[PDB]
Every structure is written in C-alpha cells, then in structure tokens.
Structure 1
Amino acid sequence: MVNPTVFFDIAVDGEPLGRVSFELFADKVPKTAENFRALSTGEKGFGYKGSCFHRIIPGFMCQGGDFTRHNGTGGKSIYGEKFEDENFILKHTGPGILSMANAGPNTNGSQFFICTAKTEWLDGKHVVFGKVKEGMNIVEAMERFGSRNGKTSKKITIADCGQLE
C-alpha cells in the first residue's frame, strides 16, 4: 500500500552528477506507475537504464524515456507499444511533477517529463503519476544543460536506475 520509490543516477557526458528519486502515485494511477517502475528496474527485459534526456527546456521541463530511438520518436510501454490515458486525477502543480509524454490521446509509451515549472496547460492532456522525492537539486543541475529549443549541450544519461526499498 506504500507508494513505490524509484531512483535514477544521472551522468553528464559520462561523468556522475547525482541521484534523483521519485515517489510513484500507485494509489491513484497504478497502471501508469507500474509501467515507470518496471521500466526503471528493467525487470521486463527493457527500460530506462542507459537512455538519455533528449529534450531539456529551462523554465519548462526535462524529457526522457525514449530508450529505442533516443530522440523523442520512440519508446514502448510494458503493455505494448502504447497504452491508454489512465486518468487525469493529478495536476501539473509545479516543479518536480512527473508526467507522461504523449502524441495524442491514449498514446502513452515510455517517454516522460519532469516539470521544472508549473505547467497547468497540460492538465487533462498528460497523465501525472509521480513526483521528485530527493534530488530536485540534481534536476535543476540537469536543466542547466538544456536550451530554448530543448537540445542539450552535454549528453544527459540515466547511468543507472532501479527501485528503492
């Protein structure tokens, strides 16, 4: 019944930066939380380890999770290539919100974003499923490698990831 916690160890051109951990709201969005959790442990045989943050826009969000094409055009969920929008109970209330990227209704895969500002205009369009627990400072450090158009100035990778006890 306690919401799960997952971590990401972040590197910058291969050099360790720090760890960000996330509370996944499995009490409110279990299907979506489970997908992110499993992708984070790699227990299905695929997932986030080694993948990059391909789009980082300071004052907006950091986006990653495209472990098949590395640029925002790929990824897949543990349920198939895509899955439905589970619900929109949770809103984009400020920095640290963890939400699913998508390409239209009912097109969730593996891509996600971490907000670094309130993004209210995404409410009811993107499924919010977690929040940063520890290491928002590390998110803020990653954010400084982004740009207005989202292209990063150094390669930002998930060097390791998994589930915390």
Structure 2
Amino acid sequence: GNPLVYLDVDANGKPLGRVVLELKADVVPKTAENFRALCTGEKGFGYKGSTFHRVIPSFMCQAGDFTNHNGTGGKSIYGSRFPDENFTLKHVGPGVLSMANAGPNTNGSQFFICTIKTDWLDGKHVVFGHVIEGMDVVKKIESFGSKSGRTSKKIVITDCGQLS
C-alpha cells in the first residue's frame, strides 16, 4: 500500500511528538516517492535536521528547505526541481500535505501541512498526502507561527523516516 512516513519535531530543543503522514503514491507516485526518500535520507540528503521555517496560524506550516533553511532552497531526488504531477487531490481541510512551489513545475523538497481548507491552492499546488496521526503536534507548530510566517520558536525535524 501507500507509504506511511514520520516526522519527529522539536520546538526550542524539546520534543513535541510525531507527525505521521500517508503519501498518496497511488495518485501521485513521483511526488510521493520524492517525499518518502527525503524522509529516509537514503539518497544522502533529506529532511533530518531541517526546520519549519514559515508557519502562519489559521493557514499552514511549511518546511523542507534543507539546503537554505529559509524558503529559497531545497532539492528533489530527481534534480533541483520537478514538474507538477497532477492536481487530482484537493486542499480539502486541515491535515492536507501539499508541495510548496514558486510557480508551475517548481517542486523541490518544500512542503506544507494545512491547518484549514485552502481551496484557492487547488490546481496550483500538488497535494500528495495527509496527516494520519499527530495533528496535535501540527497545532503546536501552528501556534508558534505569525502573520508574516516568522516562527517564535525554533521548529526542527530531529528525526524522520518510513514506517511502512
């Protein structure tokens, strides 16, 4: 079946707990595969040690820039950027996992977890999974965001990987 992956998250160096994500490889295999491998780190790079650098309450929590840690960087397992696979899955509500981008066909490694329905992102961002467990952790992360996206605590993915 679809991969289950995890992110263990600290805030200011103390654990918040674990976010478990189902990756919809059946709908978006290339996008799911990229995220999966970045969680295990099997290509020699990935999310371990990186941050949630942009968090906006009542919107989303963004992470995945493991090269620049500021929203400008990241890379995929395929190369620096890869195409929008499809827009089949929609931003239906809290828990949606979707690719951040800088316009059409600029997926790299940055991703966001929604804390609300973000319907205006349908057809613009590739949705590729959702939160199975740990929405409480996501709400904690969300609570350390701001209007500008600037975080008030240092939010770090200390560990990540694949469960199944």
Same fold (TM > 0.5): yes
Provide the rounded CA distance (Å) in 1 between the counterparts of 2:36 and 2:84: 17
- TM-score of the aligned structures, taking structure 2 as reference length: 0.99
Query: Is 1:54 matched with 2:53?
Result: yes
Provide the rounded CA distance (Å) in 1 between the counterparts of 2:69 and 2:88: 30
- What fraction of aligned residue pairs are identical, expressed as a percent? 75
Provide the rounded CA distance (Å) in 2 between the counterparts of 1:164 and 1:114: 19
Residues 38-82 of structure 1 deviation map (CA, whole Å, 9 limit, x = unaligned):
000000000000000000000000000000000000000000000
Match of residue 62 from structure 2: 63
Match of residue 22 from structure 1: 21
Residues 76-113 of structure 1 deviation map (CA, whole Å, 9 limit, x = unaligned):
00000000000000000000000000001100000000
Give runs of ≥4 in structure 1 deviating > 2 Å. none
Q: What amino acid is the match of 1:105? A: P
- Structure 2 unaligned runs (5+)? none
Residues 12-39 of structure 1 deviation map (CA, whole Å, 9 limit, x = unaligned):
1111110000000000000000000000
- Structure 1 unaligned runs (5+)? none
Q: 1:133 Cα shift?
A: 0.3
Q: What amino acid is the match of 1:74? A: G
Which residues in structure 2 correspond to 1:7-156 (within 5 Å)? 7-156=6-155
Provide the rounded CA distance (Å) in 1 between the counterparts of 2:40 and 2:144: 26
- TM-score of the aligned structures, taking structure 1 as reference length: 0.99
Specify the SS of the correspondent of 1:51: coil
Q: What amino acid is the match of 1:55? A: R
Provide the rounded CA distance (Å) in 1 between the counterparts of 2:70 and 2:61: 13
Provide the rounded CA distance (Å) in 2 between the counterparts of 1:64 and 1:117: 17
Specify the SS of the correspondent of 1:137: helix
| Matched residues, number | 164
Q: CA RMSD in A?
A: 0.5
